[PDB]
Amino acid sequence: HQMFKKVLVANRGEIACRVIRACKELGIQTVAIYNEIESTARHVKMADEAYMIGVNPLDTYLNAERIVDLALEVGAEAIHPGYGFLAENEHFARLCEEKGITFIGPHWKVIELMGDKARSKEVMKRAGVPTVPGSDGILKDVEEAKRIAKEIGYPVLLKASAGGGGRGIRICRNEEELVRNYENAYNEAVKAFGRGDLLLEKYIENPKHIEFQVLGDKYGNVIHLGERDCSIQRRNQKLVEIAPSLLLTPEQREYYGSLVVKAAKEIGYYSAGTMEFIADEKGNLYFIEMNTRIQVEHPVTEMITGVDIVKWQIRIAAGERLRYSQEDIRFNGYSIECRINAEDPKKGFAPSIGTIERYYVPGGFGIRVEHASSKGYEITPYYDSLIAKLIVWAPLWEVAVDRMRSALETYEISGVKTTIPLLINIMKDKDFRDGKFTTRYLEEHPHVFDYAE
Amino acid sequence: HQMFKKVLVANRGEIACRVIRACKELGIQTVAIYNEIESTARHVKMADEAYMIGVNPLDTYLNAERIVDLALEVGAEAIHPGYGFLAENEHFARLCEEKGITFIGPHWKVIELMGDKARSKEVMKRAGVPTVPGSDGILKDVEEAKRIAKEIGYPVLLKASAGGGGRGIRICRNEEELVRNYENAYNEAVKAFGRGDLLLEKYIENPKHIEFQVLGDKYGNVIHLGERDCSIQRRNQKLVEIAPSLLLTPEQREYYGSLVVKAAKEIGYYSAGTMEFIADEKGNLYFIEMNTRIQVEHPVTEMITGVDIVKWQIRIAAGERLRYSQEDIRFNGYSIECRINAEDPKKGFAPSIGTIERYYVPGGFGIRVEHASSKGYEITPYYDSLIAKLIVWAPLWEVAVDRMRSALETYEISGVKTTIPLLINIMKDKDFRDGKFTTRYLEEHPHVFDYAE
Numbered sequence: 042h043q044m045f046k047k048v049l050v051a052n053r054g055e056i057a058c059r060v061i062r063a064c065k066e067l068g069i070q071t072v073a074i075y076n077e078i079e080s081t082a083r084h085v086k087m088a089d090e091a092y093m094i095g096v097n098p099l100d101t102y103l104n105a106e107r108i109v110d111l112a113l114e115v116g117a118e119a120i121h122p123g124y125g126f127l128a129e130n131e132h133f134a135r136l137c138e139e140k141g142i143t144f145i146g147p148h149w150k151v152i153e154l155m156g157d158k159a160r161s162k163e164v165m166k167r168a169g170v171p172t173v174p175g176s177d178g179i180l181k182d183v184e185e186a187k188r189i190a191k192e193i194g195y196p197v198l199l200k201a202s203a204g205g206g207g208r209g210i211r212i213c214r215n216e217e218e219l220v221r222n223y224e225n226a227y228n229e230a231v232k233a234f235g236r237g238d239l240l241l242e243k244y245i246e247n248p249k250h251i252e253f254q255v256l257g258d259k260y261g262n263v264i265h266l267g268e269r270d271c272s273i274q275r276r277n278q279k280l281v282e283i284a285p286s287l288l289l290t291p292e293q294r295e296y297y298g299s300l301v302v303k304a305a306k307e308i309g310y311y312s313a314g315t316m317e318f319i320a321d322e323k324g325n326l327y328f329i330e331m332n333t334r335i336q337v338e339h340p341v342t343e344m345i346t347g348v349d350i351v352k353w354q355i356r357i358a359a360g361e362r363l364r365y366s367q368e369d370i371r372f373n374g375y376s377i378e379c380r381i382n383a384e385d386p387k388k389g390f391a392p393s394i395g396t397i398e399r400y401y402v403p404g405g406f407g408i409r410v411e412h413a414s415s416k417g418y419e420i421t422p423y424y425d426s427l428i429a430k431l432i433v434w435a436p437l438w439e440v441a442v443d444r445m446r447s448a449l450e451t452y453e454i455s456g457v458k459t460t461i462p463l464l465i466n467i468m469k470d471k472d473f474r475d476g477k478f479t480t481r482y483l484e485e486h487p488h489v490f491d492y493a494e
Numbered sequence: 495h496q497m498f499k500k501v502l503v504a505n506r507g508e509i510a511c512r513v514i515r516a517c518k519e520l521g522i523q524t525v526a527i528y529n530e531i532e533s534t535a536r537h538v539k540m541a542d543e544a545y546m547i548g549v550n551p552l553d554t555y556l557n558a559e560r561i562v563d564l565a566l567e568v569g570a571e572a573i574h575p576g577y578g579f580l581a582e583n584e585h586f587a588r589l590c591e592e593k594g595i596t597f598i599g600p601h602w603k604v605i606e607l608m609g610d611k612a613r614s615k616e617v618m619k620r621a622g623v624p625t626v627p628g629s630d631g632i633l634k635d636v637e638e639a640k641r642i643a644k645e646i647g648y649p650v651l652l653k654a655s656a657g658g659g660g661r662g663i664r665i666c667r668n669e670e671e672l673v674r675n676y677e678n679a680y681n682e683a684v685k686a687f688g689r690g691d692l693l694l695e696k697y698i699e700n701p702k703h704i705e706f707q708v709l710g711d712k713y714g715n716v717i718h719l720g721e722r723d724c725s726i727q728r729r730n731q732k733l734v735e736i737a738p739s740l741l742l743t744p745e746q747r748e749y750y751g752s753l754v755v756k757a758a759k760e761i762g763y764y765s766a767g768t769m770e771f772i773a774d775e776k777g778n779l780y781f782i783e784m785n786t787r788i789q790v791e792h793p794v795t796e797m798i799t800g801v802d803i804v805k806w807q808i809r810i811a812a813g814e815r816l817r818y819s820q821e822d823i824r825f826n827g828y829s830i831e832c833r834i835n836a837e838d839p840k841k842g843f844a845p846s847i848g849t850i851e852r853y854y855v856p857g858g859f860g861i862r863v864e865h866a867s868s869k870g871y872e873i874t875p876y877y878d879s880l881i882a883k884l885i886v887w888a889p890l891w892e893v894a895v896d897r898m899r900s901a902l903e904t905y906e907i908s909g910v911k912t913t914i915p916l917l918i919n920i921m922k923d924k925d926f927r928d929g930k931f932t933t934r935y936l937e938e939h940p941h942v943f944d945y946a947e
């Protein structure tokens with residue numbers, strides 16, 4: 042029914058701007074938060090009011106009690122967490138509810154439930170979703186790992202159960218690599234995610250990363266919005282994403298999409314979320330993780346379905362019914378998203394600290410840009426290296442590639458190194474154009490790293 | 495029918511970038527031209543090669559012999575003229591033909607035929623198109639004007655028959671005004687178009703400006719892409735354009751659209767062109783002029799139909815067949831374009847000459863930006879004041895207005911005065927939101943000029 046009067050965006054950069062835009066289109070006043078080093082940030086200038094908080098640049102966005110209190114002081118009725126920072130923090134979501142503030146996301150018990158990677162696999166198994174073979178929970182000790190490895194069969198995978206962003210993932214091809222990499226990844230988790238909890242699963246060979254988008258309202262209406270292929274990756278982090286995948290047929294799209302919809306109804310999911318799968322070389326999908334939040338790559342799904350995911354998050358959070366049924370969801374054409382990161386591909390994607398000098402954003406038919414940058418934007422060590430997301434749409438796959446290549450060739454950024462020259466070479470690459478890429482794509486195509494300056 | 499290997503773009507600014515992008519997506523090499531004062535122009539950076547020519551800033555783009563000669567010297571097979579400059583210059587289009595260069599546009603004989611408004615009305619009249627009552631042809635002298643005025647009935651409008659861009663037009667509400675305005679519109683047209691000849695037509699009070707987009711191939715297959723409402727104007731030049739119009743029902747859309755197709759086929763039109771109509775209070779359309787070229791506002795039509803008009807221009811000029819029938823052309827949703835000009839609306843829209851300092855381009859779902867600017871872009875007195883075209887799309891009219899208001903509120907440009915604050919107020923105005931605008935809109939809503947600076 043009634044829309045929020047005021048929403049506080051507990052995030053920064055391009056996802057803050059994305060949420061602020063959806064709010065402005067809905068007529069909601071907005072509140073930004075920022076650290077002193079970002080007094081000139083774009084999200085600060087776009088919001089109707091903005092507040093400088095935190096004792097360091099991360100504490101600005103990670104201090105739940107302070108952010109909830111600021112919400113109350115200024116009269117914000119809801120909080121959008123974006124992605125990262127506190128978006129999948131169940132204590133933050135629960136604190137909002139206790140205080141009368143609507144968290145724009147799923148219910149906090151669902152966040153808690155799906156926040157442990159092992160537990161969410163067990164939940165999805167019981168709901169009928171095929172999952173990657175592995176441990177059924179945390180690993181007690183490395184003896185337990187030595188056993189189960191033998192059970193699943195090498196090569197296996199060690200994964201931080203409280204992990205994210207690609208951190209805490211080490212492959213193990215024998216029990217000698219296992220024990221070493223066990224200490225290697227364990228210490229790495231106590232210090233990185235707060236919990237040393239490691240799980241184990243089968244390493245699937247030459248895999249593709251396939252993920253389904255769900256969207257549900259507070260009245261049990263859940264739909265899926267098709268899938269994305271996010272296989273091109275560095276440090277187990279996505280670089281290029283496409284929708285729909287090229288792998289799946291329309292009939293498999295609807296089948297797997299019905300399974301995730303069924304499972305999301307079972308756990309009582311509403312708002313936006315995504316179920317991530319690994320596709321084996323035979324093309325069978327196994328569930329690995331759920332993100333109970335918007336994802337970076339949500340725009341490619343919006344471009345082929347016509348559905349504004351972030352704006353539906355906010356409407357849903359205010360109690361609006363989801364005005365679609367599944368039969369209404371069509372998958373028109375193809376969309377590609379490239380992450381423009383401030384890092385240097387030829388030096389192992391080392392971050393590129395500095396200041397943007399020249400900056401020209403392309404535009405045109407079928408081009409969308411998600412960004413928060415201008416000349417003078419400083420790349421700092423504190424935050425994700427993402428500068429912009431370039432997104433294109435076309436009716437045919439090959440036109441979408443050509444459109445993306447031509448958009449990247451016109452995207453001028455100087456003062457820091459970026460991924461743009463690498464991405465241009467990927468668009469020119471025969472295999473990519475033919476649809477042949479796994480998660481090992483960069484490893485198997487070293488010539489995409491050959492470019493000038 | 496092979497595609498061109500190389501195209502020369504005989505233009506600048508946003509339209510040269512728009513054409514260059516279409517060429518890159520098609521795999522065509524591009525050639526830019528520029529004046530020494532614009533050596534940092536974006537169209538020069540985007541092209542594969544660029545040539546500094548001309549003895550002053552306009553001669554760069556208006557010297558037909560030098561441009562055609564350059565195209566021959568570098569092996570360009572085709573020239574795209576954009577809009578303005580030589581795009582409706584029959585001599586340029588015919589010089590291209592004599593030299594074996596393909597002009598991307600309609601045949602030079604149709605350009606010459608429709609280059610005089612009086613003759614164009616007579617041609618449309620004989621083809622079945624309703625026209626504005628007035629003189630049958632050009633006026634021989636003022637003394638003839640007085641006679642035909644009394645016949646048609648005041649109020650009447652004098653117009654330069656060799657006219658474009660809004661110059662040479664005068665409302666006359668009595669014989670005293672007619673005699674004054676004749677000499678003034680005559681002298682203005684001589685200085686402005688080389689030819690002082692005037693026509694007279696009935697002044698339609700409170701009109702809307704409704705225009706139909708046509709697209710034809712060289713094999714006689716002509717379609718229409720519906721209409722646009724371009725009523726919001728200053729100095730008789732468009733500022734805000736929407737598609738479709740809100741005025742016409744789907745049945746009038748196809749009726750008036752069938753008439754323009756029929757007339758286009760009769761004169762053997764191909765490539766892109768536009769037929770402009772005035773609509774009276776009772777909802778009836780009268781033809782006033784044809785533009786035998788792409789127009790500034792073509793993107794709103796691309797957003798509701800999905801047809802890439804510039805890319806089709808280029809394919810048509812190469813001899814491809816048009817891959818559409820009239821039945822394929824759907825009109826999905828609503829699109830609005832706002833011209834972001836470097837001018838001060840509070841001072842009569844006088845051009846604002848200076849250098850862009852702060853510059854941030856908005857992006858998002860349903861937003862397209864056509865622009866050639868960056869920090870340091872210099873607005874010179876020699877060229878049009880257009881900085882950027884902001885285009886939005888939505889399924890419903892009200893969401894399109896909200897989306898445009900929100901995009902405009904986040905478009906940061908400092909260093910020069912622009913139309914952005916005025917445009918924001920139009921989007922907030924109740925009359926505009928309800929569809930109630932005529933070409934008198936800006937004179938009748940002084941409140942849209944109220945804003946802080």
Ligand SMILES: Nc1ncnc2c1ncn2[C@@H]1O[C@H](COP(=O)(O)OP(=O)(O)O)[C@@H](O)[C@H]1O
Binds near residue numbers: 173243
């Ligand atoms: N079982 C697996 N087999 C092969 N590759 C995997 C497997 N599990 C994860 N990966 C790779 O690790 C990348 C990210 O793993 P994820 O489990 O999604 O960890 P994060 O929580 O850091 O996203 C995946 O995109 C995929 O490329």
Ligand SMILES: Nc1ncnc2c1ncn2[C@@H]1O[C@H](COP(=O)(O)OP(=O)(O)O)[C@@H](O)[C@H]1O
Binds near residue numbers: 129203204332336338
């Ligand atoms: N569980 C998490 N806790 C904290 N930050 C996270 C978590 N998961 C992801 N992030 C951060 O969220 C941001 C984006 O996630 P990324 O993996 O880059 O794209 P996706 O939206 O596809 O997961 C990155 O900065 C990543 O490190």
Ligand SMILES: Nc1ncnc2c1ncn2[C@@H]1O[C@H](COP(=O)(O)OP(=O)(O)O)[C@@H](O)[C@H]1O
Binds near residue numbers: 626
């Ligand atoms: N007969 C008319 N009655 C009322 N307004 C007119 C009439 N003819 C032209 N106009 C107005 O003047 C504008 C300029 O008309 P046009 O003939 O299209 O001149 P230009 O060639 O400079 O476009 C039109 O958009 C419309 O606003």
Ligand SMILES: Nc1ncnc2c1ncn2[C@@H]1O[C@H](COP(=O)(O)OP(=O)(O)O)[C@@H](O)[C@H]1O
Binds near residue numbers: 579658
């Ligand atoms: N017949 C013409 N001859 C020369 N320049 C023209 C002519 N018609 C329009 N122009 C110029 O072309 C450019 C854009 O045309 P405008 O009238 O601004 O939008 P549209 O494409 O709707 O005409 C402006 O600089 C205008 O002055």
Ligand SMILES: [Mg+2]
Binds near residue numbers: 206317330
């Ligand atoms: Mg993941």
Ligand SMILES: [Mg+2]
Binds near residue numbers: 659783
């Ligand atoms: Mg006109």
